[PDB]
């Protein structure tokens, strides 16, 4: 026959190989594909979907729905911080378990722009101003409302619009396995209401992926454990 | 004749027909967007930093070994560009290095003016790493030695190995310029930004060092000045920093 | 670690194909060359819900459609015994794929081994590992990773389960004993989905899995806790 | 010797590709089939600074960009013991490449062995030596052979080091013990850079290397000495 | 399948083989190349660069910078030899550790033309003449200034030019593992100065590769040693 040499790497099983395999059941007619709605070709499609951020991770709240609810005090000190979390979608526990965070925790390297949406869930008659401050990586979290105003920020007027959208340009991953940027909110004004409401207003946070994320090295997620067989 | 060069609020004078060594043949340039890349890594240039910075002159003597500066660190306290290093996390810039030498026709000596990229230096103690102070003193020159240095965390500053474990006579592989007092008194090296990444933190990493090593010792006639000033003038070129504004 | 680098917007392996077409070890069992009562054979019902990582990755979708590329890594070790002068010839193994609804072997010498409609591969040790591919074998249009229904409505324990996700069962045994001594072989089945289609994406599983055939869970916190909502010092 | 011959101006193998794309032995380790505490496995962090010849050749440049073509020469020898009638079947070895930032095996039976994102090659003895290729795995644009900086500025011992030159770690172990007797295997990893790009040439190292992770050196003379500067008699 | 014969040499590992290898990490997107200045494609580029020659290899000088400095005596005997070394870029310790010598010591066979540059580093007012004499291989080193003048030589006038460039046509290697040519300098005149300088003038030597070198058989350099493992 044709003279050949087997070459190093023959008769080896590399698990990450793309060799054709013999069909165990040839001459069997598989059922044709039927058009199921919701076909997904890429995990970024799930990543790009808004997911509610549990900003209120204080002790005793992660087991209840009010971990997603940012409390807004009616009688609060002027210029105080409403909320603030490190801007690490994969490391910080605030953004870690969201859809974008779950997608990112499947890959070693990633970089892109996140989209943060804050929705005010008070009464339509309520009026107030918030100062959403973005700190670039390495800058550090601002300590006063004035330092926040002197940096990148938006004045979120509750009376005019009940939702605010922020796109953060420099995200990236931070480790193979601080100094990542911060997003903070401040009381520019207080929340003004016509009548006396016993309960305080709440703010809902949403994180999402913009079209510019890459993911490069798939790995095992750190949020599932299997230490023994099921049988 | 003589050519005067002004950058910002600083002016220097250089002789015409003076050779300029342009790095590795590459003039410093700004970073280029790759097919209209997204605003995920915005870049911010600064043109106010494109000015001459003049370090304090180092006194070249008869028994004087070399000097060196690490210019990311050597300009870290020179007003602007130092404030820019402090304020911005990622930085990128090239430099124009002017090395002047004030000597009369009765002076002798030769100097190797070389800009060594990634000049990682060893320690005097084998099982140690040199400290920040010994490696780079900022605007103050660090001096080579005529013998082995002693110190727990001191740089091995013996001039024969240039602190890198190589032959000092083979340092000409890097962008260099010889200063022979009978022929030359100036050296102009234009160093492009050289790194393995487009931008990097500047406090945390030195792109290159400038070594001024007297190969032929300084000499003079009786009555002439026993020392000769060596002036280093630096103009940062095409300084870029990470954009601080919100992407949207 | 992992300093800031340029973003090249590589979506290449974020696709479902590169996300799921990874060869993962899903099962390993041992069987002896000699058996007490003809039970010296290994078997594995093909399921994607035993390994918690592949299960989570697949359950990030509602419906899937893929091929079953199975690779078997059979290694035999000689156990300690008083038998001397064994000199075992080379060992041959039989790996049977029982299609859904096919005859099921009961012992190591059952008639279901010497059938005709169950694909079987005979592999002799010292060669490349055996490899067979199973097509999309369901009579439905896709594999349902979740089923909000019952196999029989009048049965409590049939919730979920479905009946169209049956992918068959694998059976492994020694063709020849080789020597009159103890030999035990491990199969170490490697699973790799091929030509994957997925529909209706789902949130990733948050609570640790309890059973392979259940979605039952102990309620867990949505994320880890932190001391303060504000980043104040 | 080497009389005067014609100069044909062959620059062919003076190129960086022919200068560096040479297969060199960079590591060799031994591991037993049976282990005292599950530590019977070999490992090597992929570094180009352990062999002083390849290190010098690579450090004649500042930045490099190459692929890692690794060839493993596994040979097993049976140690002397009182066990009789071993009759070991053929031995299979597993060589795992842990990518930068991947799970690290601690013992011979750790979960990191049976992972999914660490490329593993299973090679049975008696065949051609196993071979795997690692691409340019850095997130930077090149491998920096020198680094005049710190991994962390506020740390003394982080000078040099960098964080982008991590090429991963190799792990070697026995898939099967074969026989109930002592068997020790040597891996003898062979390294060969591929598709090499190099920038910013540097003077060759003059002082002997002291540590693999250092540039520290004992000062040495620029060359050997001679009696007289003049060639007089 | 297709009938083939394995042929002798199959299943062998020849370390100097150019067979394609299976990628351990396929479907991983490597970072694109970025234009780093100073790209090198050939070691001759390093060889062609001027390197300072340590001509003054006398005992006690190789550990100091003054091994590269050729001393020029103001009050020296007329017709004396300033310096002289065998013209072996790979064998003689004078040229051995230079850039060209280091490149050549990586290859078994080489041949070409070296370029020698001598730079006078005295005062601009200094004046003198030197006689750079080239002896072909097998000729032997000249013993007087007259024998040097009767051979190949250049009169290096310090007053006119402070640098002299010499290209040597017949270099080649000398061994697999005298009679190679010589270059010598002689005092044609003395060094004349206007005023009294206490220190003597120095001459710097530079060696370089011309475009006509070949290198044919790569080998291990003899200037690095590793007798034990680092771990």
Numbering used by the authors:
A (entry chain 3), E (entry chain 3): 1 to 177, 185 to 238
B (entry chain 2): 12 to 259
C (entry chain 1), D (entry chain 1): 49 to 281
Quoted passage from the original study:
Coxsackie virus B5 (CVB5) is a member of Enterovirus-B (EV-B) species, which can cause various human diseases, such as viral encephalitis; herpangina; hand, foot, and mouth disease (HFMD); aseptic meningitis; and acute flaccid paralysis (1–3). Similar to other EV-B species, CVB5 is a nonenveloped, positive-sense single-strand RNA (+ssRNA) virus. P2, and P3 will break down into nonstructural proteins responsible for genome replication, whereas P1 is the precursor form of structural proteins VP1-VP4, which could be packaged into an icosahedral capsid. Here, we determined the atomic structures of CVB5 in three forms: mature full (F) particle (2.73 Å), intermediate altered (A) particle (2.81 Å), and procapsid empty (E) particle (2.95 Å).
